[PDB]
Chains A and B, each alone.
Chain A
Amino acid sequence: SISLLELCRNTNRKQAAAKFYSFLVLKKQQAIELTQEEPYSDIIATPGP
């Protein structure tokens, strides 16, 4: 329900990569689940069980 790029507008490469890595690693504990359809596109953040 929460997108990514619109909160990543005014950021540099380092912090953007760090927060993308955090977004990708937080799913390992099924906290937030993500679904992608187009290879280079935004994904909304829908929390998991």
Chain B
Amino acid sequence: MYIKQVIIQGFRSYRDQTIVDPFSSKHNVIVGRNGSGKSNFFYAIQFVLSDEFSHLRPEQRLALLHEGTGPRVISAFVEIIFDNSDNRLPIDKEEVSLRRVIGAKKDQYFLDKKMVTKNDVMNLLESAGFSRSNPYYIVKQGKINQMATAPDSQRLKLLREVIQLTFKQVSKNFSEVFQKLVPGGKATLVMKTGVGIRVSFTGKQGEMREMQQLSGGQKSLVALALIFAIQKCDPAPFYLFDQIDQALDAQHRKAVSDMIMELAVHAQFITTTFRPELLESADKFYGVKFRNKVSHIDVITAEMAKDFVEDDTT
């Protein structure tokens, strides 16, 4: 609901202390270089609020600790403290401390600075709007193009979770947000068992079609349009957009940046982009470096990020 602070200690790229200046209120873009630790930061953010990291064999979990300097780090520390100012969380604490501590065998939680088991967190996160069942609103790197072409069963399940009456107006919200993104588009949800997505763009007359046949860039637009429609109908905690616009053109990048600015007021949208188009719609930027096999996190001013991503820095 409000990503305020993040602390990382030897998770996957930041061996030593990496205390960060607390996040912005609306939007956050994390620019950086290749092999630096942007995704590992996003994976850390969703490491405490997404189930599908700790469900696997202790092999990817074992390699999930920083071993680049030799011996494995005893404590892989990731912490994000929330802000229940709007009383959305069941706990009525203005600054809720939430974190997961993982080591060689440890996988436990600390809540407001006390030890606790994994079993206590699903209820509080689901009551806070966190959808741990599916990787919704936490879109991974390069996955924004699979939500659009997903079969109608998955979309029906998504809308069911988000029940029988909170879909008619979701269709209208999707229509309005999609015409906002694409001036000529006329996509619309259709309810048959399954839900179809009659997508269109630049034709406006009879070009209604089926989702699979769309282009590889229109799919990202459709997927983020559905995400934003679900946001507008029912608020969600926040959004992690790791290279959300690596596939779509700059023309939509400006068209998604301005409208995410128009949407950033209600909820926080932590993102990551290498194109300067999306970073004009934030307040507190970021910069992730990779030196001497120990990455670092440091806030950078707007002109610094603009210079970093405007031209080659080789």
Residues of A within 8 A of B (CB): 25, 28-30
Interface readout for B199-223 with A: 1 if CB under 8 Å, 0 if not? Answer: 0001000000000000000000000
Contacting pair A25 B183 (CB below 8 A) = no
Q: Which residue of B is nearest A26, CB measured?
A: B251
Set of chain B residues within 8 Å of A30, measured between Cβ atoms = 202
Taken together as a complex, chains A and B put the C-alpha atoms of A29 and B255 apart, in Å, by 13
Q: Is B95 an interface residue (CB 8 A)?
A: no
Set of chain B residues within 8 Å of A29, measured between Cβ atoms = 183-184, 251
Q: Which residue of B is nearest A29, CB measured?
A: B183
Set of chain B residues within 8 Å of A25, measured between Cβ atoms = 249-251
What are 9 contact pairs spanning A and B, CB under 8 A?
A: A25-B249, A25-B250, A25-B251, A28-B202, A28-B251, A29-B183, A29-B184, A29-B251, A30-B202
Extra inter-chain contacts (4) besides given A25-B250, A29-B251, CB under 8 Å: A25-B249, A25-B251, A28-B202, A29-B184
The prevalent SS among residues of A at the interface is: helix
| Count of chain A to chain B residue pairs whose CB atoms are closer than 8 Å in the complex | 9
Taken together as a complex, chains A and B put the C-alpha atoms of A25 and B183 apart, in Å, by 15
Residues of B within 8 A of A (CB): 183-184, 202, 249-251
The prevalent SS among residues of B at the interface is: loop
Set of chain A residues within 8 Å of B251, measured between Cβ atoms = 25, 28-29
Counting from the closest, the 8 A-B pairs by CB-CB distance are A25-B251, A25-B249, A28-B251, A29-B183, A28-B202, A25-B250, A30-B202, A29-B184
How close is B138's CB to chain A, nearest CB, in angstroms? Answer: 31
Q: Which residue of A is nearest B311, CB measured?
A: A14
How close is A29's CB to chain B, nearest CB, in angstroms? Answer: 7
Set of chain A residues within 8 Å of B202, measured between Cβ atoms = 28, 30
Taken together as a complex, chains A and B put the C-alpha atoms of A11 and B251 apart, in Å, by 24
Taken together as a complex, chains A and B put the C-alpha atoms of A38 and B56 apart, in Å, by 58
How close is B248's CB to chain A, nearest CB, in angstroms? Answer: 12
Set of chain A residues within 8 Å of B183, measured between Cβ atoms = 29
Taken together as a complex, chains A and B put the C-alpha atoms of A47 and B249 apart, in Å, by 22
Q: Which residue of A is nearest B184, CB measured?
A: A29
Taken together as a complex, chains A and B put the C-alpha atoms of A25 and B249 apart, in Å, by 9
How close is B104's CB to chain A, nearest CB, in angstroms? Answer: 51
Taken together as a complex, chains A and B put the C-alpha atoms of A30 and B249 apart, in Å, by 16
How close is A4's CB to chain B, nearest CB, in angstroms? Answer: 20
Taken together as a complex, chains A and B put the C-alpha atoms of A40 and B274 apart, in Å, by 33
How close is B102's CB to chain A, nearest CB, in angstroms? Answer: 46
Taken together as a complex, chains A and B put the C-alpha atoms of A28 and B202 apart, in Å, by 8
How close is A22's CB to chain B, nearest CB, in angstroms? Answer: 9
Set of chain A residues within 8 Å of B249, measured between Cβ atoms = 25
Taken together as a complex, chains A and B put the C-alpha atoms of A30 and B250 apart, in Å, by 17
How close is A34's CB to chain B, nearest CB, in angstroms? Answer: 16
Q: Which residue of A is nearest B201, CB measured?
A: A28
